[model samples]
Target: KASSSILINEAEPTTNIQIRLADGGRLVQKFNHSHRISDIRLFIVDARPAMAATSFVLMTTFPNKELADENQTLKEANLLNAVIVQRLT
Candidate 1:
């Protein structure tokens, strides 16, 4: 498997980058070591007396299957996966 680094603001890659995309057949696996598998939320609000606390949230957005698959591949290969810190939204 091959790897590369990417910068947050710049057009090129950086040295202290984090994120690993492993080859998984035709699908590229994406992951960030700094992040854990979990559910994410986005809040919304309304003010109509009866609609006081209404919001929409993403119940689940993690345990990234692609990343998990790559991690599995690395483990099976007996290779330590790279530590990635950031993930593009």
Candidate 2:
């Protein structure tokens, strides 16, 4: 007889992104590739509740592009290996 249960051996996929602070420090976080950009924002706000009251934007360097879509996913934004920074608006 075969068992009905199955075991998965692979770890869930995650992506590491960096948030550069205005003070020259960095906040590095690992998130599931499936999570939305807003979800990541919420995670940051949870840790720093004051962030809820602060307005900021996310950006990518080298070319200096803004990631302006809140509903976009990490994978959709092509941020799997991207370094993002938070800028006060």
Candidate 3:
């Protein structure tokens, strides 16, 4: 008899987030639910290399709130859906 082993590595759930740029451009990105707000900021900087990392701010559109806590996860921030975020200089 031969025994077979199965390997499983579950991936974290991802959410679709819309990022609104200061120039009126929009970017839709998918991120893990457990990803921190800082990760989002990094993504923005990488996507928009023209903007400095410290030159912009991120905020939620509907309720109009800044994502101040960099350590907070998307799940903790209740952003596990199609949330829209604004980037302003």
Candidate 4:
């Protein structure tokens, strides 16, 4: 028998992600490198419960890149110390 198990969580480093809202509001959050975008999305709603009824997306600062993949992580996504933008969907 072959042992096949996947493990991706090991002493993951943390990153500081600053989020800039579409309405000019801003906030900062910390997450492990292993954390995915989906967790970040959930965080946005948790931080600002007022926007629970609406939908939104995450974006980058410099070139204004959109982060559409929820499966992507902070480190691999190249979002270390990056300013993220939130756009209403």
State each model's CA lDDT, in order: 0.25, 0.54, 0.53, 0.55
User: Model 3, 14-78: lDDT tens per residue?
Assistant: 55555565676665655555656566555655555555553655566666666544475666766
Between candidates 3 and 4, the TM-score winner: 3
Better of 3 and 4 by lDDT: 4
Per-residue lDDT over 1-89 for candidate 4, one digit per residue giving the tens place of the 0 to 100 score: 11112123355446545555567666666566665656755665455566667555656666666654447665676655444455554
Question: Alpha carbon lDDT of residue 88, candidate 3?
Answer: 52
Clashes of 1: 3
The C-alpha RMSD of each candidate to the native structure, in angstroms, is 14.6, 9.4, 10.2, 8.7
Q: Show the lowest summed lDDT stretch of 10 residues, model 2.
A: 1-10
Task: Give the distance in Å from residue 87's predicted Cα in candidate 3 to where it truly belongs.
Answer: 2.8
Q: Candidate 1 — which residues are off by over 4 angstroms?
A: 1-25, 37-80, 83-89
Q: TM-score of each candidate?
A: 0.18, 0.53, 0.52, 0.50
Candidate 2 clashes between residue pairs 3 or more apart in a chain or in different chains: none
How badly does each model clash, as a count of residue pairs? 3, 0, 0, 0
Model 3 stretches with alpha carbons more than 4 Å out: 1-14, 22-24, 70-72, 78-82
Root-mean-square deviation of Cα positions for candidate 3 versus the true structure, in angstroms? 10.2
